[PDB]
């Protein structure tokens, strides 16, 4: 069954879902005093696709962005629910929801298959949800287990271990926003399996000066590329 | 392969799940109700908790009441027993709403037995793991004690023990007649039976000294015994 | 898993019904109903279904309405549930139709309910067998019997032992004299079937008769008198 | 628990196959043969059924729609009743007779819902729906248990449906009159039974035509079939 | 299985029911979609038994609504049901938005429906993959492909069904961005015929423009099949 | 093994194996400790840290002015229970104008626990909660997956709690007559026996007479840890 | 309308007139107001004609179902109980003033049922617009023990009084005698032009269709 | 929770229906014979059981009677349902339900239990005899829910032999008495063991009437 | 007043082996504006069953659709025509199922009961199904009083098809000429076991 415990005290279904988030393209999220930056590889499977139709970094709200790994249909369902809930909060309260609150809402939806108090199975998805609220910039990680952990810098995807190791190695609290972009891009280059360049990577930032989701374009990527070592 | 659902009869007509419930109840803490000359005495011996030294002294209590004049105790799961006791209180409330008088004991016992037995009929419900004791004592009618089994069977006794070692508490209790003994004389007897204390035993009666209404036994009465 | 659910087997049998019937038989409780010309009697053992216990409270006989009674043998929870279902059906019939249901209608409704169990695989069979006795509108006794299978049948005499009743009845073949003779018949039938001497306090006898339709149970003194009359 | 007794009727097999649908198809393939074909005059449906038995393959759905059945007869009756309900509801809603393809789509949706929803088994029946409407003239449709359907000028269902199909393709022609189509139907009914002569007491034969602008269905009695049989025999 | 979960996670993390729906899609007939400046061409494979099956009755090249068309590979009854739901949603969009449903919105709707079936108790996943061609709100033409899992993506030219990998590889080496209607139709045909037997009865090619969807008359298909014969010698 | 497949099956040993597995899910949570004196209750728990760049996981939660909790087990189930209790306390304070009786709230939570154990379609809550409050008296309760709850003088559960249990058993007789600082330091010393405690990896809250539930601030925690060490 | 009933030795005599009115206009001259519920139970009605007719059909068919299930002769008590429950379920609406007679194990039982769901066991009763005249006759001449012939004569005279004194009553006199064994339904118990030249009416068109 | 317990076998059979058919075949024999001016349903059955209480032959409506072979409880349920449906038709249309339509409705109700979830099929076969403006009918309803139209049939033990007997002695144009004599002969291939119902309203023969035949 | 919105009248009569059903052809609006003159109120259920619906036009159409649905279902499921009496009972029950929110229609059923013997069958209803079977004639609609006068004064028993046509047409026309909101043409249908005669009378258009 779906709601069955193991003899060790772990649900089988969420344990199996943990293996699903390990697939898909790798994304990195970095939080600095000036804002939060999410970058993502794009594993373009063919030259006939419209590259921009496949999305990685969606806007849960004006001040919230999210990078998803795992089953992308499930991820789209989760992000749509998050968007609806964040707009409902904005209407009821007339203010931008907190990032942590949004992650909690996503988590409560994610485990709705248990029926403790309707989806039929766990969400085989892992989300890096970043954004800027009254408290400042912040970046969160939520996974099928339902547990959400706040992160200074994090990575997800197939090459999560390498990116996360590099982020641990090269991350400094005082580092600037430009350094945040350079670090995100160099980590993605080291951890990606292609030649980093325009149209190959997707970057978005929610800056504290604006608390607004901003999607990069070419000549924003290229600017970082020409400063990489 | 006939012991995986409560709704399947074995070839021999038996319902194994209920037998397993019976084993579970036989492995749990001891409880007993004893009808004496002037009242009924309920005592619950929590021998499973000799390990837990951090439990607030005398906090754990398996003895409850209905209408203040019915003692209800149990042997089994706390959750299942609480479910049963909540149902008994709900039945009493509905009865008083309907008729403006307290529910008769036998009607309450029948309704509780039906409530328990309804859970041994379907494949999507877990049957209750709790033997129940419901007792009362009136000045005119003297004492009335009912034991309800996990299967829905209810029976009337002058003294009943449900739980561990019940076959020794029975033989020590059966050793002498208690209908011609006051409750206060019995408190000393029940203690000697348990030894063959002040923080692992729940005590209560309904007798003349308490106006035939529920009451936990005040400490200055238990300690000298 | 063919014998677990109330579904057919390769031979076409519903083994769960036979298992519930064996469960009823396991209780080792015997009950006997006998019809007379203007009276019907049910005698049951006053033992529990397999010292400080209250022996008066132990009974296998129940009152469905004032004038209709039953003996239910089986798992005690199932017996009480069937008694309550019968009483609910009787009250519903009285309310909806404005007169007292007779034993035939009650047995047939109870068997419809039993069939619902025997067909819907999500419920378990009641291991309860029953005798119901009453007096119908034509002033004659009705004595019907039903089992876990949902089969009801009217009887002149039934047990829940056939040849014993046959011999007794063919031997038998005033209203007060009829009542007394049928009561003696029932007590002797139970004594014969059990094959051991009865105790006046371990057996319960109830009667319905045209003189007094109300289903009543006769006191232990009268039962003792009847037992004494036998063997004398 | 109960899912241990559950069979999971609505589930994909490893090969992208519905086991229930395949077994229902097998059951229908073990049913008696029903054939249908289109003539210029109208649509023909034929079929083959103890001596104490007093129509169990061809049924009327509406003044302008009729159906030949293969598979389980009780499921066929349920679906025929539902199809009659659907046609009458269309007439109720629009004030015009239901086009044949629309009724086929509705009944096939009801078939497929049982293979996608719930935990029940599929209908183990297949239909040959013949009818006439103004937009598409004469139409014959084949419907299998999965809710898939197709349109034909001549087809067969049931036992030996391949030999009947071979006979139909070899003989069926665009330009046939009612009598020639009936003779071809009898010939196919003969060939699928591996018999040189059909016997007229195990044959069902009916036809739907348009005449004077009115749709008319004839279900052939035994003696009319005797006449058809003798005609088929001299040639 | 009224509410029993049908799609569950395997020990490795996979949702086997979705791979089985993918197998169902792989069993279906081939279809191809190619996008141009302001029109698209959809060529579907058709297989009917000659002389006995009515060829007009089968329709895998469906007009969803005024501006959006669809092709599918997989189970046909599931395809019909999903198409009816999609048409109902197109008209609900008209009725509530007062504007025609853009192609991307319809593709998202079908993708979410397939996801829903993949994520609800007591329902089997749709065993069909679709190519939906239409026009966006800015009047730009787009082609989307939706998979049984509920994943969707837009394409310049995409092939679905059986032997879709070979048609994809061919279209990679042959698609040349903006192409004239005649040559775009020819490319669609010669791409689909890499896998299906060369015969005008084994194909159905339609073309979608801002005015309407038109099915190509069979004389042209015969001429192009003969031209492909010529190029094959 | 046939007896541990669903939550409504009793083993021949008269055991529910699914509920025992839900309880075994409680041993792999972080160690938390609660102790009380004649006026206060102090709850101290170890925050889990899953990487260098991670922020410590929240360990204790506020239920009401004088009610707080700590959890051990599945976090999402604990969140559902936490929101249930918070809405219960708030609904009580809205319907009436008084704080909820603590025994009533704990018994309602136990009802919520035991309800899930009855139906096959549901599974027991896989988390154990310790509830610390002041309702005329400092009170510590513990709930369990099987619907059983108890009241304690000192409590601890989580990974490696046996050391904390031994410390509490040794020092139980002091807690009653300990002052606030002494009792905070006893709870911290138990928690330390469980293991280094830092301002980041330890959570500590108090609640008592005329002292609403309050997490202890960072400077105070640093001073207290210095006193401990 | 005028319906009446009375209890005579071992029988029930129901009587009724045979007129239905669309207000001031006589819509039916030979309407039948005595309604067969079961072999031993008959009813007559006043009020909304559709309500009377359909409630009577419902009661008849439910009583037949009950008789089939219980194999017991129906009871007038059951009929009045079902009728009262149905009439009360609608808070007054579905107006049906019903005289329900029968013979059962408890002898000849006559009931009067009010539209609001009230019933009354009666020796004789009348309902309808001409109810007061029928009551006058019955009161004046009724007596406890009467033969079937005397009961029929009294019913006929009462119905005739209603007919000839009430404008809403008229037509024939239907009567029914119900006994524990059978019934007899005397439908007509008592019963108190231009041919245009062919082709005179002009037409615009004519269509002939042969079936 | 609600799922079919009757499922297609790998060969396309519904083994639960086959098993119910086996059960009906192991049940007491019943039969029906349609005579030129009527139709009769007959059936065969310890000094204690009251005979009157266990009628197998029952009256669906004034001109419709029913007999069964199989499980008595299922028969009681289906008899109550058939009476309910006949009464519903009477209430709707004001006339007695036709035999064929009642058979169709009961057939649908029986088929429902072969497809809906959590229910076993009815373990009985029914013979329904009746007379309407369209003559006399004798229908057989199977556990599967399929209904056959018969001139004569037998639905119990050794029903192959009994069918052969009826076929070898049945003639299209026969009188009621000739049919009843054939019916009794078929069943015996005592009077207390015979129950017969004849179609005036449908009637069930009394003990003496069976004896004098 | 609801019935005054559209007006209309239907009239049935019986003779010897023949039965006539006639109706007016007006569809009005707001009780005085004649919007159509081809609005026939006679509907054929089957060769032996005809119905005439008078009252609110929308209710007439809805009820005709419901009756056609039910009759077609019955006939297809039985492979035989519905009996006229069964149709009358079904119509009564359909009317009464809407007792409290009724269709404002006053139907009459006309036809032949088959026994072959073809006995004329007539019956009238109110809006809630209260039905009166009558042996000579039936009337419904706003012109009910005038029609009752006509069929009272002029009805002759056992008239052949021509005599019945003349009598019924005269009755209908004379009744209509005294009615403001009913008229504008008259349709007459005479059924005999072999054929139907349909005639449109030359009536006033006032």
PDB file of C-alpha atoms in Angstrom, chain E residues 56-180:
ATOM      1  CA  UNK E  56     -13.744   8.091 -43.874  1.00  0.00           C
ATOM      2  CA  UNK E  57     -14.836   6.811 -40.461  1.00  0.00           C
ATOM      3  CA  UNK E  58     -11.386   6.919 -38.813  1.00  0.00           C
ATOM      4  CA  UNK E  59     -10.092  10.386 -37.890  1.00  0.00           C
ATOM      5  CA  UNK E  60      -6.745  10.768 -36.141  1.00  0.00           C
ATOM      6  CA  UNK E  61      -6.337  14.293 -37.577  1.00  0.00           C
ATOM      7  CA  UNK E  62      -8.882  16.104 -35.428  1.00  0.00           C
ATOM      8  CA  UNK E  63     -10.054  19.700 -35.519  1.00  0.00           C
ATOM      9  CA  UNK E  64     -10.262  20.668 -31.854  1.00  0.00           C
ATOM     10  CA  UNK E  65     -11.825  24.096 -32.420  1.00  0.00           C
ATOM     11  CA  UNK E  66     -11.692  27.111 -34.726  1.00  0.00           C
ATOM     12  CA  UNK E  67      -7.897  27.483 -34.699  1.00  0.00           C
ATOM     13  CA  UNK E  68      -6.445  24.368 -33.014  1.00  0.00           C
ATOM     14  CA  UNK E  69      -5.942  20.856 -34.395  1.00  0.00           C
ATOM     15  CA  UNK E  70      -4.607  17.618 -32.958  1.00  0.00           C
ATOM     16  CA  UNK E  71      -3.075  14.267 -33.867  1.00  0.00           C
ATOM     17  CA  UNK E  72      -2.532  11.315 -31.547  1.00  0.00           C
ATOM     18  CA  UNK E  73      -0.696   8.016 -31.261  1.00  0.00           C
ATOM     19  CA  UNK E  74      -1.892   5.341 -28.852  1.00  0.00           C
ATOM     20  CA  UNK E  75      -5.235   3.905 -27.770  1.00  0.00           C
ATOM     21  CA  UNK E  76      -8.001   5.251 -29.985  1.00  0.00           C
ATOM     22  CA  UNK E  77     -10.834   5.251 -27.439  1.00  0.00           C
ATOM     23  CA  UNK E  78      -8.677   7.036 -24.875  1.00  0.00           C
ATOM     24  CA  UNK E  79      -7.797   9.482 -27.644  1.00  0.00           C
ATOM     25  CA  UNK E  80     -11.466  10.130 -28.422  1.00  0.00           C
ATOM     26  CA  UNK E  81     -12.292  10.684 -24.752  1.00  0.00           C
ATOM     27  CA  UNK E  82      -9.367  13.066 -24.250  1.00  0.00           C
ATOM     28  CA  UNK E  83     -10.279  14.921 -27.454  1.00  0.00           C
ATOM     29  CA  UNK E  84     -13.848  15.408 -26.258  1.00  0.00           C
ATOM     30  CA  UNK E  85     -12.610  16.764 -22.927  1.00  0.00           C
ATOM     31  CA  UNK E  86     -10.234  19.083 -24.796  1.00  0.00           C
ATOM     32  CA  UNK E  87     -13.027  20.420 -27.009  1.00  0.00           C
ATOM     33  CA  UNK E  88     -15.204  20.999 -23.960  1.00  0.00           C
ATOM     34  CA  UNK E  89     -12.374  22.981 -22.375  1.00  0.00           C
ATOM     35  CA  UNK E  90     -11.799  24.989 -25.565  1.00  0.00           C
ATOM     36  CA  UNK E  91     -15.448  26.033 -25.534  1.00  0.00           C
ATOM     37  CA  UNK E  92     -15.383  26.741 -21.794  1.00  0.00           C
ATOM     38  CA  UNK E  93     -12.440  29.051 -22.527  1.00  0.00           C
ATOM     39  CA  UNK E  94     -14.398  30.829 -25.264  1.00  0.00           C
ATOM     40  CA  UNK E  95     -17.356  31.173 -22.909  1.00  0.00           C
ATOM     41  CA  UNK E  96     -15.393  32.498 -19.910  1.00  0.00           C
ATOM     42  CA  UNK E  97     -12.535  34.347 -21.630  1.00  0.00           C
ATOM     43  CA  UNK E  98     -14.536  35.603 -24.650  1.00  0.00           C
ATOM     44  CA  UNK E  99     -11.525  34.706 -26.815  1.00  0.00           C
ATOM     45  CA  UNK E 100     -10.396  31.541 -28.612  1.00  0.00           C
ATOM     46  CA  UNK E 101      -8.201  29.150 -26.662  1.00  0.00           C
ATOM     47  CA  UNK E 102      -4.514  29.596 -27.582  1.00  0.00           C
ATOM     48  CA  UNK E 103      -2.625  26.477 -28.630  1.00  0.00           C
ATOM     49  CA  UNK E 104      -0.341  26.609 -25.595  1.00  0.00           C
ATOM     50  CA  UNK E 105      -3.298  26.836 -23.205  1.00  0.00           C
ATOM     51  CA  UNK E 106      -4.917  23.767 -24.784  1.00  0.00           C
ATOM     52  CA  UNK E 107      -1.644  21.841 -24.657  1.00  0.00           C
ATOM     53  CA  UNK E 108      -1.292  22.731 -20.978  1.00  0.00           C
ATOM     54  CA  UNK E 109      -4.874  21.604 -20.375  1.00  0.00           C
ATOM     55  CA  UNK E 110      -4.346  18.196 -21.976  1.00  0.00           C
ATOM     56  CA  UNK E 111      -1.025  17.818 -20.158  1.00  0.00           C
ATOM     57  CA  UNK E 112      -2.656  18.596 -16.808  1.00  0.00           C
ATOM     58  CA  UNK E 113      -5.493  16.167 -17.539  1.00  0.00           C
ATOM     59  CA  UNK E 114      -2.980  13.408 -18.256  1.00  0.00           C
ATOM     60  CA  UNK E 115      -1.036  14.303 -15.104  1.00  0.00           C
ATOM     61  CA  UNK E 116      -4.270  14.220 -13.098  1.00  0.00           C
ATOM     62  CA  UNK E 117      -5.080  10.732 -14.337  1.00  0.00           C
ATOM     63  CA  UNK E 118      -1.503   9.749 -13.492  1.00  0.00           C
ATOM     64  CA  UNK E 119      -2.028  11.175  -9.982  1.00  0.00           C
ATOM     65  CA  UNK E 120      -5.519  10.113  -8.840  1.00  0.00           C
ATOM     66  CA  UNK E 121      -6.883   6.956  -7.272  1.00  0.00           C
ATOM     67  CA  UNK E 122      -9.185   4.752  -9.301  1.00  0.00           C
ATOM     68  CA  UNK E 123      -8.175   5.889 -12.808  1.00  0.00           C
ATOM     69  CA  UNK E 124      -5.850   4.458 -15.463  1.00  0.00           C
ATOM     70  CA  UNK E 125      -3.348   6.767 -17.224  1.00  0.00           C
ATOM     71  CA  UNK E 126      -4.185   7.800 -20.763  1.00  0.00           C
ATOM     72  CA  UNK E 127      -2.125   5.611 -23.076  1.00  0.00           C
ATOM     73  CA  UNK E 128      -1.852   8.282 -25.769  1.00  0.00           C
ATOM     74  CA  UNK E 129       0.596  10.952 -26.898  1.00  0.00           C
ATOM     75  CA  UNK E 130      -0.629  13.997 -28.802  1.00  0.00           C
ATOM     76  CA  UNK E 131       0.731  16.642 -31.161  1.00  0.00           C
ATOM     77  CA  UNK E 132      -1.380  19.812 -30.983  1.00  0.00           C
ATOM     78  CA  UNK E 133      -0.885  22.522 -33.605  1.00  0.00           C
ATOM     79  CA  UNK E 134      -2.443  25.951 -33.335  1.00  0.00           C
ATOM     80  CA  UNK E 135      -1.923  29.676 -32.956  1.00  0.00           C
ATOM     81  CA  UNK E 136      -0.970  31.680 -29.885  1.00  0.00           C
ATOM     82  CA  UNK E 137      -2.611  34.902 -28.726  1.00  0.00           C
ATOM     83  CA  UNK E 138      -0.010  36.872 -30.706  1.00  0.00           C
ATOM     84  CA  UNK E 139      -1.193  34.915 -33.794  1.00  0.00           C
ATOM     85  CA  UNK E 140       2.078  32.956 -33.849  1.00  0.00           C
ATOM     86  CA  UNK E 141       1.791  29.303 -34.822  1.00  0.00           C
ATOM     87  CA  UNK E 142       3.068  26.655 -32.434  1.00  0.00           C
ATOM     88  CA  UNK E 143       3.267  22.869 -32.191  1.00  0.00           C
ATOM     89  CA  UNK E 144       3.191  21.123 -28.808  1.00  0.00           C
ATOM     90  CA  UNK E 145       3.707  17.477 -27.887  1.00  0.00           C
ATOM     91  CA  UNK E 146       2.108  15.941 -24.800  1.00  0.00           C
ATOM     92  CA  UNK E 147       3.148  12.587 -23.349  1.00  0.00           C
ATOM     93  CA  UNK E 148       1.217  10.069 -21.229  1.00  0.00           C
ATOM     94  CA  UNK E 149       3.008  11.196 -18.058  1.00  0.00           C
ATOM     95  CA  UNK E 150       1.582  14.691 -18.521  1.00  0.00           C
ATOM     96  CA  UNK E 151       4.849  16.283 -19.653  1.00  0.00           C
ATOM     97  CA  UNK E 152       4.574  18.641 -22.613  1.00  0.00           C
ATOM     98  CA  UNK E 153       6.990  20.618 -24.759  1.00  0.00           C
ATOM     99  CA  UNK E 154       6.872  22.768 -27.883  1.00  0.00           C
ATOM    100  CA  UNK E 155       8.671  21.744 -31.063  1.00  0.00           C
ATOM    101  CA  UNK E 156       9.550  22.945 -34.537  1.00  0.00           C
ATOM    102  CA  UNK E 157       8.927  19.486 -36.002  1.00  0.00           C
ATOM    103  CA  UNK E 158       8.077  16.356 -34.052  1.00  0.00           C
ATOM    104  CA  UNK E 159       6.993  12.782 -34.721  1.00  0.00           C
ATOM    105  CA  UNK E 160       5.112  10.481 -32.350  1.00  0.00           C
ATOM    106  CA  UNK E 161       3.976   6.879 -32.378  1.00  0.00           C
ATOM    107  CA  UNK E 162       5.810   3.766 -33.459  1.00  0.00           C
ATOM    108  CA  UNK E 163       9.335   4.259 -34.822  1.00  0.00           C
ATOM    109  CA  UNK E 164       9.276   7.880 -33.666  1.00  0.00           C
ATOM    110  CA  UNK E 165      13.042   7.911 -33.078  1.00  0.00           C
ATOM    111  CA  UNK E 166      13.849   7.297 -36.751  1.00  0.00           C
ATOM    112  CA  UNK E 167      11.400   9.964 -37.921  1.00  0.00           C
ATOM    113  CA  UNK E 168      12.899  12.364 -35.377  1.00  0.00           C
ATOM    114  CA  UNK E 169      16.422  11.683 -36.646  1.00  0.00           C
ATOM    115  CA  UNK E 170      15.290  12.193 -40.246  1.00  0.00           C
ATOM    116  CA  UNK E 171      13.489  15.444 -39.407  1.00  0.00           C
ATOM    117  CA  UNK E 172      16.628  16.656 -37.619  1.00  0.00           C
ATOM    118  CA  UNK E 173      18.660  16.310 -40.821  1.00  0.00           C
ATOM    119  CA  UNK E 174      15.941  17.669 -43.127  1.00  0.00           C
ATOM    120  CA  UNK E 175      13.900  20.411 -41.401  1.00  0.00           C
ATOM    121  CA  UNK E 176      14.990  23.764 -42.854  1.00  0.00           C
ATOM    122  CA  UNK E 177      13.046  26.340 -40.808  1.00  0.00           C
ATOM    123  CA  UNK E 178      10.707  28.394 -43.039  1.00  0.00           C
ATOM    124  CA  UNK E 179       9.524  26.249 -45.950  1.00  0.00           C
ATOM    125  CA  UNK E 180       6.871  26.753 -48.599  1.00  0.00           C
TER     126      UNK E 180
END
